[PDB]
Design a protein around this ligand. Structure first.
Ligand SMILES: CCCCCCCCCCCCCCCCCC(=O)OC[C@H](COP(=O)([O-])OCC(O)COP(=O)([O-])OC[C@@H](COC(=O)CCCCCCCCCCCCCCCCC)OC(=O)CCCCCCCCCCCCCCCCC)OC(=O)CCCCCCCCCCCCCCCCC
Ligand code: BCL
Ligand SMILES: CC[C@H]1c2cc3[nH]c4c(c3C)C(=O)[C@H](C(=O)OC)c4c3nc(cc4[nH]c(cc(n2)[C@@H]1C)c(C(C)=O)c4C)[C@@H](C)[C@@H]3CCC(=O)OC/C=C(\C)CCC[C@H](C)CCC[C@H](C)CCCC(C)C
Ligand SMILES: CC[C@H]1c2cc3[nH]c4c(c3C)C(=O)[C@H](C(=O)OC)c4c3nc(cc4[nH]c(cc(n2)[C@@H]1C)c(C(C)=O)c4C)[C@@H](C)[C@@H]3CCC(=O)OC/C=C(\C)CCC[C@H](C)CCC[C@H](C)CCCC(C)C
Ligand SMILES: COC(C)(C)C(=O)/C=C/C(C)=C/C=C/C(C)=C/C=C/C(C)=C/C=C/C=C(C)/C=C/C=C(/C)CC/C=C(/C)CCC=C(C)C
Ligand SMILES: COC(C)(C)C(=O)/C=C/C(C)=C/C=C/C(C)=C/C=C/C(C)=C/C=C/C=C(C)/C=C/C=C(/C)CC/C=C(\C)CCC=C(C)C
Ligand SMILES: COC(C)(C)C(=O)/C=C/C(C)=C/C=C/C(C)=C/C=C/C(C)=C/C=C/C=C(C)/C=C/C=C(\C)CC/C=C(/C)CCC=C(C)C
Ligand SMILES: COC(C)(C)C(=O)/C=C/C(C)=C/C=C/C(C)=C/C=C/C(C)=C/C=C/C=C(C)/C=C/C=C(\C)CC/C=C(\C)CCC=C(C)C
Ligand SMILES: COC(C)(C)C(=O)/C=C/C(C)=C/C=C/C(C)=C/C=C/C(C)=C/C=C\C=C(C)\C=C\C=C(/C)CC/C=C(\C)CCC=C(C)C
Ligand SMILES: COC(C)(C)C(=O)/C=C/C(C)=C/C=C/C(C)=C/C=C/C(C)=C/C=C\C=C(C)\C=C\C=C(\C)CC/C=C(/C)CCC=C(C)C
Ligand SMILES: COC(C)(C)C(=O)/C=C/C(C)=C\C=C/C(C)=C/C=C/C(C)=C/C=C/C=C(C)/C=C/C=C(\C)CC/C=C(/C)CCC=C(C)C
Ligand SMILES: CCCCCCCCCCCCO[C@@H]1O[C@H](CO)[C@@H](O[C@H]2O[C@H](CO)[C@@H](O)[C@H](O)[C@H]2O)[C@H](O)[C@H]1O
Ligand SMILES: [Fe+3]
Lengths: 51, 52, 325, 274, 256, 43, 51, 44, 51, 44, 50, 44, 51, 44
C-alpha cells in the first residue's frame, strides 16, 4: 500500500545494519534450539543411523 | 540525557521481570538473575543506542 | 547540596588532540584514528586517542596472542572441541604446569610441554611491553618512572614463574594458566609451605598493598576536595604553588601532624605501590628454597600466638544443643 | 609551629559543635569538640589494651591478644577478663573512629574545601563496623569479631576464610580483590606520570599536563586525564572498601555452605546440555 | 640453604633486617622530599620557631621551567608569601585562631585566602593560554550534558544575579573550567567568573550556593576578557570557597 | 514529512527493491521449511 | 534484479572487512562443531579405520 | 541521485558485477565441497 | 573472474598484506597444533612407535 | 575511476598479476605437501 | 618473477626486524618441541647410549 | 611508478637481489641441516 | 659479497645492544639446559668420577 | 645512494669489515669449544 513512507522516518543505512545483525542472530538461535532437542539434532540423528 | 537514563530504567525493569518470569517456570533465583542482569545490559544498552 | 566533582555536568568536544611531538618523530608510528565516547567522558577524558605502535608493542601483542591462543586452544581441545562445554567450564579449565617428575627438563607436550612453549611467548610479550614503556619515556624525554614501576611488577611476575622454579629445580612450581586454577594454586601454595600469613614479607607486602589503597583513597579524595581551587592541575601546582596545594597540605597537617607537597605525595604513592610486589617477590623466593614451613618459623622466632582454651566443640556445646533438641 | 603559609588559614569558626571553647591548635594538630573525644577514646582504648596485655602475661606486641567472648555469651556483656575488655575497646574504637571522621569535617570546613576525605574514611569505618558489630549481630554473638592482636587477628582471617572451604571462590571476594590489585596499579601509574613529567632526564625542561596526557595515549591508546584519574582513583578505592564489606557480611549470615558450592547455579543451568 | 648463620638467623631472617635498614632510609628520604615548600616553620608572630623538627631540610633541586620561564629551586625563599594580612591574634601565645580585622572575603583571609602566584596565564604545550572562552575557541561545542549558556544564575539565598553569557574551557584537555556570569545592573556591573566546581547545573538554572546575591559585585575581575592569569584564578576561586563560611553568621557559628 | 532528508520518489524506489529482496529471502526460507517438514515434521 | 544500489548505502571498504571476518569465523565454528561429534570427527575416524 | 557513500550509480553496477561473480565462485566451491562430504558421510 | 583486480582499488595493499601474513601463519600453526594433539597424526609419536 | 587507495586501474592490474602468481606458487606447494601427506597417512 | 616490487610496498627496515624476531622464535619453538619427545631428544639419547 | 615507501623501482630490484642471496644462503644451511638430521633419525 | 649494506638500514648503536644481550641470554640458557641433563652436568660428573 | 641511517656507502663497507672480524673471531673460539666438548662427551 503506502508502507514505502517508513524510509522517510528510518535511516536506510542505520536499519540495514540492525536488520542484518538481527537476522543472523535469530537464525543461529533457532538452529541451536534444534540441536538442544534429541529429535531434531541431525548430528546425533545421523550417528544413530547406520549404527 | 533524560532518554539514555530512561532507556536504562526500562532495561533494569525488564531484568526484574526476567528474573521473576524465569523463577515462575522453574530455574532458580541466581540462574534467573543472571539472565535478568544480562537482559538489562543488552536490551537496556540497545534501547539507549538505537534511539536517543 | 554542594556539587561533588564526581561527574562532569557538561562536556565540550572539539577537534581531536593528536598529541605533542618532538624531533623523535612520534607521529609516524601513530594510528591517527580517534574516536569519542560520551559515556566514559562523564568520569574521565572522552577521547579514545591514537595509539603509538612501534616494534616492542607489535612484538608483545603478537607473542601475547600466541600465548593466549596456545592456552586457549588447548583448553578447547581438553573438552573435545565442545563449544557449549568450553563456555560452561571456562573458569575451571587451565593449562597445567609440567609434572614434578620431569624436573627442569622439557616435558611431553600433553604433560606440560605446551605450557613451557606458551610460557616462553608470555615472557617475551611481557618483556617487550616493558621495553615499549621504557622506549616511549625516552622518546618523550620524560622520566623512566613508569618503566621502573612496571619493572617492580615484573619482578614478582618473574619470581613467581621463572626464578623460583629454577631455584627449586622443577618447572612444576609455576602457576597454572586458569581463572580458578591459579586461585587453587594460591591456596595450595600457602598450605604446602606452612601458613603464608606468617611469612614476614607476605605480611610486609600486605602493609604496602593496604597502604596503596589507603593512600590513593586519601590522595583521590584530597584532590577532589581541593579541585575547587584548581587542584586537579597537579603539575602546575608543583611549579607554582597555589592555594590548592596549601589547603591540601594544611588539612593533613592539622589532622595527623604532618603533610606532603604536591610532588612529594607522588613519591609516597610511587613507593608504596612499587614495594608491594618487590617485598612479595622476596617472600615467594624464600618460600620453599629456604624455609619450607612458615608457622614453624614463626614459632621458632617467637611471634606465633598461643591459645589456652580447648578445641573440640564438645568443650563449648553439645550436638543436641546445637540442633535444638 | 606554623608553616611558611599556615598563618593566613588559621581563622576562627567552622566548628560543628562547641564553638570556640575547643577551637584551638595543639602543636600542628587541630583540637575540636571531636578532637577532645578522639583523645579520650583513643587513650582509653590504648590503655585498656595494655591493661589486658598485663593480665595476659605478655607485653610482646606480636603476642598481645585481646579476644572476644565465647559464642555462649551471645549478644550480652561478658566478664572483662573473659572477653568483656574486648567489647569495651570496640566501643572506644568506634567512638574514636567516628570522632576522627567528624573532626576531619571540622578541619575541611574551616579550610573551605570539600568533604570527600571524611566521606572516604567513612567507607573504611563501614568496613570495620561490618566486621565487629554488624556481622556479629546477624550471627547472634559478639564472639564473631576478630581479636585485637597483631598476629592473632590473622588467625581469625585464616579460620574464617577456611570456614567456607575455599574463600577464593566467594564472588564478592573475587570482585573486591580485583579492586585492590587495580587500585595499586592505578596508584603506581598515576604517581609515575607526575614524577616522570616533573623529573625529566637531567638537562631537560619539565613537562606539562599535555605531555603526560599524550604519553598514555601513545602507551595504552587512552588517557583518562588529570582530573579523571583522581576521580576514578577514589571510586576504585571506595569500591574496594565497600565490596570487601560485602564479602564478609554474606559469609555466614547469607551463605553457610562452602563457597565453591555457590557456583552450582552456573554449572547446572537448564541451557547447558547434559 | 637451610643452615643458619648463628642461633636461628637464616637467610630469610637476614633479608628482613636488610629491608628494615632500607625502609628507614626510604622514610628519611621521602619525608625530606616533602619539606621543599613551607619551611622553615616560623611561629604565630612570624619569627622562625625554636623547633624545626627531626628531619633537616633537603638539598636544593632545580626545575627547568618551559616556555622560557627560567629555573626554580624549591628549597628556598617562597615567592608565594602574602604580606599585610588583615588578621589579628586572638591570644598572646601560640596555637589560637586569628580574627580578621575587616571583611574576610574582601581581604582574602582564611577560607577566602589566595596565594601570590605568577601574574601570567597558564600555557599549553604550544605556548598559548590554556584557558580561553569558547567564543575564541574554534571547533569546540557542547557534546553532552546541559548547556548552561543563557540560563539564569541563582545565588545562595535564592536571588537571581544574572544569566550565563559565556563559559571558559581548557582546550588542551577539552574540559570546562569557568562560567561567565553577566551580572544584572541591580547586583553588579560587568562579568564575573565562577569555577565549574562551585556551580550545579539544572534544567532551567545554574545554582551557586556559596555566595549570596550581595557578594557577587565584589568577585575579583580579570584584567582582560580573553585570558585569566594564575593570580586571578587563585583570587576568583578563593572568593567563592570563602563564602562557604563567611556568607552569613549562621555558617560561621557552630551548627549544634 | 521526511526525517531522513529523503524525497518521496527515492523512498518509493528504495522500498520496491527492499520488497524484492524480502520476497527472495522468504522464498528461500519457504522452500527450506518444506524440506525440513518432509524430512522431519513437527506437526 | 537491481540489488546493486546497496552499494549506494553501504561503504564497500567497511562491508568487505565485516564479511571477511564473519565468513572465516563462521567457517571455523562449523569446522569445530564437527570435531565435537563422534560421527563427523574425521581425525578420530581415521584412527578407528586404521585399527 | 541517492548516495550515502559518494558512489555513482553507473559505477555501483560495476562494483556489484564483480561481487556477484565472487559470490558465485565462492559458492560453487562450497556446493562442490558439500557434495563431496555428503558422499563421504551423509547427514540426512 | 578475470576482473577481480579492482579489489586493490578498495583495499590498501599495505594493510592487506600485513594482515594476510599474520592470518596465514596463525592458521598454519593451528592445524599443526591440532594434528599434534591427535593420537593418529602425531608424527613425533609415530616415529617412536616404529622404533 | 573509483580510486579509494590512490591506485589507478592500470596500476592495480600488474599488482594483482604478481599477487596471483605469488598465490599460485604458494598454493602449488600446499597441493604437493597435502598430496604427500595423504599418501603418508590418509585421512579419508 | 616480478617479486622485487614487494619492497615498493613494504618498508625494508620493518620487514627485516619483523623477520629476524620471527625466525628466532620458530627456531627456539621447534627445538623445544624436539626436546619434549622421547625419540628426538638428543640429550637423553646420548645418556641412553652410555 | 608506484612507490609507497619512496625508494625507486631500480633501487628496489637491487635490494631484492641481495635479499634473495641471503635467503638462499639461509635456506641452503637449513636443507643441509635437515638432511643430516634425517640421516641421524628419520621422522618418516 | 654485498651484505655490508645491512648497516645502511640498521642503526649500529641499536643493533649491537640487541645483538649483545641476545648472545648472553642464549649462552646462559644453553649452559642451563645442559646442566639440567644428568649426562652433561659437569659439576655432578666430576663428583661421580672421584667416587 | 640509499641510507635509512645516514651512513655513506664507504663508512658502511668498512663498518662491516670490522664487524665480520669480530664475528669470525667469536665463531672461531666457539668452534674450538664445540670441538673440544665433543671429544669430552659427544652428543651424537
Ligand atoms: C592526645 C593523643 C591522642 C591519641 C593518643 C593515643 C594514640 C595512640 C597511637 C599513638 C601513635 C603516635 C602518635 C604520634 C605522637 C604525636 C606526634 C607529635 O606530636 O609530634 C611528635 C614530635 C614532633 O612534635 P610536633 O608537635 O609535631 O611539632 C611539629 C614538629 O616540630 C615539626 O616537625 P616536622 O614538620 O618535620 O613533622 C613532624 C612529624 C614527623 O614525623 C614524620 O615525618 C612521619 C613520617 C613517617 C611516618 C610514615 C611512615 C609510616 C607508614 C608505613 C607504616 C607501616 C610500616 C610497618 C613497618 C615496615 C617495616 C619497617 O612528626 C609527627 O607528628 C608524626 C607523628 C606520626 C608518625 C607515625 C605514627 C606511627 C605510625 C606507625 C605505626 C606504628 C604503631 C604505633 C602504635 C603505638 C601504640 C602505643 O616529635 C616527632 O616528630 C617524633 C615522631 C613521633 C613518632 C612516634 C611514633 C610511635 C611509634
Ligand atoms: C590462601 C591464600 C594465602 C595467600 C597467598 C599468597 C600468594 C601465593 C601470594 C600472595 C601475595 C600477595 N598477597 Mg597473600 N595470601 C593470603 C592472604 C592475603 C590477604 C588477606 C586479607 O587474607 C591479602 C590482602 C593478601 C595480599 C597479597 C598481596 C600483598 C600480594 C600480591 C602482590 C601483588 O600485588 O600482586 C600483583 C602482581 C601480579 C598480579 C603479577 C603482574 C604480572 C605482570 C606484570 C602482568 C602480566 C599481565 C598479563 C600478561 C595479562 C595481561 C593481559 C591484559 C589484558 C593485556 N594475601 C593467604 C595466606 N598471597 C603474593 C606475594 O607473596 O607477594 C610477596 C603471592 O605470590
Ligand atoms: C577506602 C578504604 C581504605 C581506607 C581509607 C582511609 N583510611 C583513612 C582515611 C581514608 C580515606 C583517612 O582519612 C584517615 C587518615 O587520616 O589517615 C591518615 C584513615 C585512617 N585509616 C588508618 C589505618 C588503616 N587504614 C586501612 C585501610 C583502609 N582505609 C582502606 C584500604 C587499614 C587496614 C585495613 O589495614 C588500616 C590499619 C589510620 C592511619 C587512619 C585513622 C586514624 C584513627 O582512627 O585515629 C584515631 C585513633 C587512634 C589514634 C587510636 C585508636 C586506638 C583504639 C581506640 C584501640 C585499638 C582499636 C583497634 C581495633 C586495634 C586493633 C589492633 C590489631 C588489629 C592489630
Ligand atoms: C604491583 C602493583 C600493581 C601492578 C603494577 C603495574 N602493572 C602494570 C604497570 C604497573 C606499574 C604498567 O606500567 C603496565 C601497563 O602497561 O599498565 C597500563 C602494567 C600491566 N600489568 C597488567 C595487568 C596486571 N596487573 C596486575 C597487578 C598489579 N601490577 C598491581 C595491581 C595484575 C595481577 C592481579 O596479577 C595483572 C594481571 C597489564 C594490563 C599491564 C601490562 C601487560 C601487558 O600488556 O602485557 C603484554 C601483553 C599483551 C599485549 C597481550 C596479552 C594477552 C591478550 C589478552 C591477547 C589478545 C587477545 C585478543 C582477544 C586477540 C584474539 C585473537 C584470536 C581470536 C585470533
Ligand atoms: C605448531 O607449529 C610447528 C609445527 C611446531 C611449526 O614449526 C610451524 C611452523 C611453520 C608455520 C613454519 C613457518 C615458516 C615459514 C613461512 C618460513 C619463513 C621463512 C623465510 C621467508 C625465510 C627468509 C629468510 C631470509 C632472511 C630473513 C634474510 C635474508 C638475509 C639477508 C642477509 C638479508 C639482508 C640482505 C641485504 C642485501 C641487505 C639489505 C640491502 C640494502 C639496504 C641495499
Ligand atoms: C547449524 O547451526 C549453526 C551451527 C548455528 C550454524 O551453522 C548457523 C549457521 C548459519 C545461519 C549460517 C548463516 C550464514 C550466512 C547466510 C552466510 C552466507 C554468506 C554470504 C552470502 C557471503 C558470501 C560472500 C562471498 C562473496 C560475495 C565473495 C566475494 C569475494 C570476491 C573476491 C569479491 C569480488 C571483488 C570485488 C567486489 C572488487 C571490488 C570492485 C570494484 C572496486 C569495482
Ligand atoms: C635449547 O636451546 C635451543 C632452543 C636448542 C637453542 O639454543 C636455539 C638456538 C638458536 C635459535 C640459535 C640462534 C642463533 C644464533 C645465536 C646465531 C647468531 C649469531 C651471530 C650473528 C653471531 C654474531 C657474532 C658477532 C660478534 C659476537 C661480534 C662481532 C662484533 C664486533 C666485535 C663489532 C665491532 C664494533 C664496531 C663498533 C665496529 C667498528 C667500526 C666503526 C665504528 C665504523
Ligand atoms: C520457539 O520460538 C523461538 C525460537 C524462541 C523464537 O523466538 C521464534 C522466533 C521469533 C519470534 C522471531 C520472529 C521473527 C521475525 C519478526 C521475522 C523477521 C524477519 C523479517 C522481517 C525478514 C526481513 C527480510 C528482509 C530482507 C532480508 C530483505 C532483503 C533486502 C534486500 C537485499 C534489499 C536491500 C536494499 C538494496 C539492494 C538497495 C536499496 C536502496 C536503494 C534502492 C537506494
Ligand atoms: C578449526 O578449524 C580447523 C578444522 C582446524 C581448520 O583447519 C579450519 C580452517 C579454515 C576454515 C581456514 C581456511 C583458510 C582460508 C580460507 C585461507 C585461504 C588462504 C588464502 C586465500 C590466501 C592464500 C594466498 C595468499 C598468498 C600466499 C599470496 C601470495 C602473495 C604474494 C607472494 C604477494 C605478491 C605481491 C607483490 C609482489 C606486490 C607487488 C607490488 C607492486 C606491483 C607495486
Ligand atoms: C576464542 O579464542 C581462543 C583463542 C580460541 C581462546 O580459546 C581464548 C583463549 C582463552 C579462554 C584462554 C584464557 C586464558 C587464561 C584463563 C589464562 C589466564 C592466565 C593466568 C591466571 C595467569 C596466571 C599467572 C601466570 C603466571 C604467574 C606466569 C608466570 C610465568 C611467567 C610466564 C614466567 C616465564 C615462564 C617460563 C617457564 C619461562 C620459559 C622459557 C624458556 C624455557 C626459555
Ligand atoms: C533417501 O533420502 C531421502 C529420505 C529422500 C532424503 O534425503 C530426505 C530428505 C529431504 C526431502 C530433504 C531434507 C533436507 C532439506 C530440505 C534441506 C534443507 C534445506 C535448506 C536449509 C536450504 C538451504 C538454503 C539456505 C540458503 C542457501 C540461504 C541463503 C541465505 C542467504 C545467504 C541470505 C543472506 C544474505 C543477505 C544479503 C541478507 C542480508 C541483507 C541485508 C543486509 C539488507
Ligand atoms: C548500629 C546498630 C547497633 C545495635 C547494637 C545494639 C543492640 C545490641 C543488642 C544487645 C542485646 C542485649 O540482649 C542480650 O541478649 C543476649 C542474647 C542474652 O544472652 C543470653 C543477654 O542476656 C541479653 O543481655
Ligand atoms: Fe595526583
Amino acid at each position: 500500500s503506502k508502507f514505502y513512507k517508513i524510509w522517510l522516518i528510518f535511516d536506510p543505512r542505520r536499519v540495514f545494519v540492525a536488520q542484518g545483525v538481527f537476522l543472523f542472530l535469530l537464525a543461529a538461535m533457532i538452529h541451536l534450539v534444534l540441536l538442544s532437542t534429541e529429535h531434531f539434532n541431525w548430528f546425533e540423528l545421523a550417528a544413530a543411523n547406520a549404527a | 540525557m533524560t532518554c539514555t537514563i530512561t532507556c536504562w530504567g526500562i532495561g533494569v525493569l525488564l531484568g526484574i521481570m526476567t528474573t521473576v518470569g524465569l523463577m515462575v517456570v522453574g530455574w532458580s533465583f541466581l540462574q534467573g538473575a543472571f539472565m535478568g542482569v544480562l537482559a538489562w545490559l543488552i536490551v537496556g544498552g540497545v534501547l539507549a543506542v538505537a534511539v536517543c | 547540596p554542594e556539587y561533588q566533582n564526581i561527574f562532569t555536568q557538561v562536556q565540550v568536544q572539539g577537534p581531536a588532540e593528536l598529541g605533542v611531538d618532538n624531533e623523535n618523530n612520534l607521529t609516524e608510528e601513530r594510528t591517527t584514528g580517534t574516536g569519542f565516547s560520551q559515556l566514559i567522558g562523564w568520569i574521565g577524558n572522552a577521547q579514545l586517542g591514537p595509539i603509538y605502535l612501534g616494534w616492542f608493542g607489535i612484538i608483545s601483542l603478537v607473542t601475547g596472542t600466541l600465548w593466549f591462543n596456545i592456552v586457549g586452544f588447548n583448553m578447547l581441545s581438553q573438552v573435545g572441541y565442545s563449544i557449549p562445554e568450553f563456555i560452561r567450564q571456562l573458569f575451571w579449565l587451565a593449562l597445567e604446569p609440567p609434572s614434578p617428575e620431569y624436573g627442569l627438563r622439557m616435558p611431553p607436550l600433553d604433560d606440560g610441554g605446551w605450557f613451557i612453549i606458551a610460557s616462553f611467548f608470555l615472557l617475551v610479550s611481557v618483556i617487550s611491553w616493558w621495553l615499549r614503556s621504557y622506549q616511549l619515556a625516552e622518546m618523550h624525554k620524560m622520566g623512566k618512572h613508569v618503566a621502573w614501576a612496571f619493572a617492580a611488577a615484573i619482578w614478582l611476575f618473574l619470581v613467581l614463574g621463572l626464578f623460583r622454579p629454577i631455584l627449586m629445580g622443577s618447572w612444576s612450581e609455576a602457576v597454572p594458566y586458569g581463572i580458578f586454577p591459579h586461585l587453587d594454586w594460591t591456596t595450595a601454595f600457602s598450605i604446602r609451605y606452612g601458613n603464608l600469613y606468617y611469612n614476614p614479607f607476605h605480611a610486609l607486602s600486605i602493609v604496602f598493598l593496604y597502604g596503596s589503597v589507603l593512600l590513593f583513597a586519601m590522595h583521590g579524595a584530597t584532590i577532589l576536595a581541593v579541585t575547587r581551587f584548581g587542584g586537579d592541575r597537579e603539575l602546575e601546582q608543583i611549579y607554582d604553588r597555589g592555594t590548592a596545594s596549601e589547603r591540601a597540605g594544611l588539612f593533613w597537617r592539622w589532622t595527623m601532624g604532618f603533610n606532603a607537597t604536591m610532588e612529594g605525595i607522588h613519591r609516597w604513592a610511587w613507593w608504596f605501590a612499587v614495594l608491594t610486589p618487590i617485598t612479595g617477590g622476596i617472600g615467594i623466593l624464600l618460600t620453599g628454597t629456604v624455609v619450607d614451613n612458615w608457622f614453624l618459623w614463626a614459632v621458632e622466632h617467637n611471634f606465633a600466638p598461643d591459645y589456652t582454651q580447648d578445641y573440640g566443640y564438645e568443650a563449648y556445646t553439645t550436638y543436641d544443643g546445637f540442633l535444638g533438641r | 609551629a606554623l608553616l611558611s603559609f599556615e598563618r593566613k588559614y588559621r581563622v576562627r569558626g567552622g566548628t560543628l559543635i562547641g564553638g570556640d571553647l575547643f577551637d584551638f591548635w595543639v602543636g600542628p594538630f587541630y583540637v575540636g569538640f571531636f578532637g577532645v573525644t578522639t583523645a579520650f577514646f583513643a587513650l582509653l582504648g590504648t590503655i585498656l589494651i595494655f591493661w589486658g596485655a598485663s593480665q595476659q602475661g605478655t607485653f610482646n606486641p606480636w603476642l598481645i591478644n585481646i579476644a572476644p567472648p565465647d559464642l555462649s555469651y551471645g549478644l550480652g556483656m561478658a566478664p572483662l577478663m573473659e572477653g568483656g575488655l574486648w567489647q569495651i575497646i570496640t566501643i572506644c574504637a568506634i567512638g574514636a573512629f567516628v570522632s576522627w571522621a567528624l573532626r576531619e569535617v571540622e578541619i575541611c570546613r574551616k579550610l573551605g574545601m570539600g568533604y570527600h576525605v571524611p566521606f572516604a574514611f567513612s567507607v573504611a569505618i563501614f568496613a570495620y563496623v561490618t566486621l565487629v558489630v554488624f556481622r556479629p549481630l546477624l550471627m547472634g554473638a559478639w564472639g564473631h569479631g576478630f581479636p585485637y592482636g597483631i598476629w592473632s587477628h590473622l588467625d581469625w582471617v585464616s579460620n574464617t576464610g577456611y570456614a567456607y572451604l575455599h574463600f577464593h571462590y566467594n564472588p564478592a571476594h573475587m570482585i573486591a580483590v580485583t579492586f585492590f590489585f587495580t587500585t595499586t596499579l592505578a596508584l603506581a601509574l598515576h604517581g609515575a606520570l607526575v614524577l616522570s613529567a616533573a623529573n625529566p632526564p637531567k638537562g631537560e625542561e619539565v613537562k606539562g599536563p599535555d605531555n603526560e596526557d599524550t604519553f598514555f595515549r601513545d602507551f595504552i591508546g587512552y588517557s583518562i586525564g588529570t582530573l579523571g584519574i583522581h576521580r576514578v582513583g577514589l571510586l576504585l578505592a571506595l569500591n574496594a572498601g565497600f565490596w570487601s564489606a560485602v564479602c564478609i557480611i554474606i559469609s555466614g549470615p547469607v551463605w553457610t555452605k562452602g563457597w565453591p558450592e555457590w557456583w552450582n547455579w552456573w554449572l547446572e543451568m537448564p541451557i547447558w546440555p547434559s | 640453604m637451610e643452615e643458619t648463620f648463628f642461633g636461628n638467623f637464616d637467610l630469610a631472617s637476614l633479608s628482613l633486617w636488610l629491608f628494615y635498614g632500607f625502609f628507614a632510609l626510604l622514610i628519611y628520604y621521602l619525608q625530606t622530599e616533602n619539606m621543599r615548600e613551607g619551611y622553615p616553620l616560623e611561629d604565630d608572630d612570624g619569627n622562625t620557631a625554636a623547633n624545626q623538627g627531626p628531619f633537616p631540610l633537603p638539598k636544593e633541586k632545580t626545575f627547568k621551567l618551559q616556555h622560557g620561564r627560567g629555573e626554580l629551586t624549591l628549597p628556598g625563599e617562597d615567592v608565594q608569601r602574602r604580606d599585610n594580612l588583615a588578621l589579628r591574634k586572638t591570644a598572646h601565645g601560640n596555637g589560637f585562631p586569628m580574627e580578621p580585622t575587616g571583611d574576610p572575603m574582601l581581604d582574602g583571609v582564611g577560607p577566602a585566602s589566595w596565594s601570590k602566584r605568577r601574574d601570567v596565564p597558564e600555557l599549553d604545550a604550544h605556548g598559548h593560554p590554556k584557558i580561553v572562552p569558547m567564543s575564541a575557541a574554534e571547533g569546540f561545542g557542547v557534546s553532552a550534558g546541559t548547556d548552561p549558556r543563557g540560563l539564569p544564575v541563582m545565588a545562595g539565598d535564592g536571588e537571581i544575579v544574572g544569566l550565563v553569557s559565556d563559559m571558559w574551557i581548557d582546550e588542551a584537555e577539552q574540559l570546562v573550567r569557568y562560567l561567565e556570569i553577566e551580572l544584572d545592573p541591580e547586583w553588579g556591573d560587568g562579568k564575573r567568573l565562577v569555577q565549574r566546581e562551585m556551580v550545579r547545573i539544572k534544567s532551567d538554572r545554574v545554582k551557586v550556593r556559596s555566595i549570596y546575591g550581595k557578594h557577587f559585585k565584589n568577585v575579583p575581575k580579570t584584567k582582560s576578557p580573553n585570558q585569566v592569569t594564575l593570580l586571578e584564578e587563585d583570587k576568583i576561586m578563593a572568593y567563592y570557597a570563602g563564602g562557604t563560611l563567611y556568607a552569613d553568621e549562621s555558617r560561621l557559628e557552630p551548627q549544634l | 514529512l521526511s526525517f531522513t532528508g529523503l524525497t518521496d520518489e527515492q523512498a518509493q524506489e528504495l522500498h520496491s527493491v527492499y520488497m524484492s529482496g524480502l520476497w527472495l529471502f522468504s522464498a528461500v526460507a519457504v522452500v527450506a521449511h518444506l524440506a525440513t517438514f518432509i524430512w522431519r515434521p513437527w506437526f
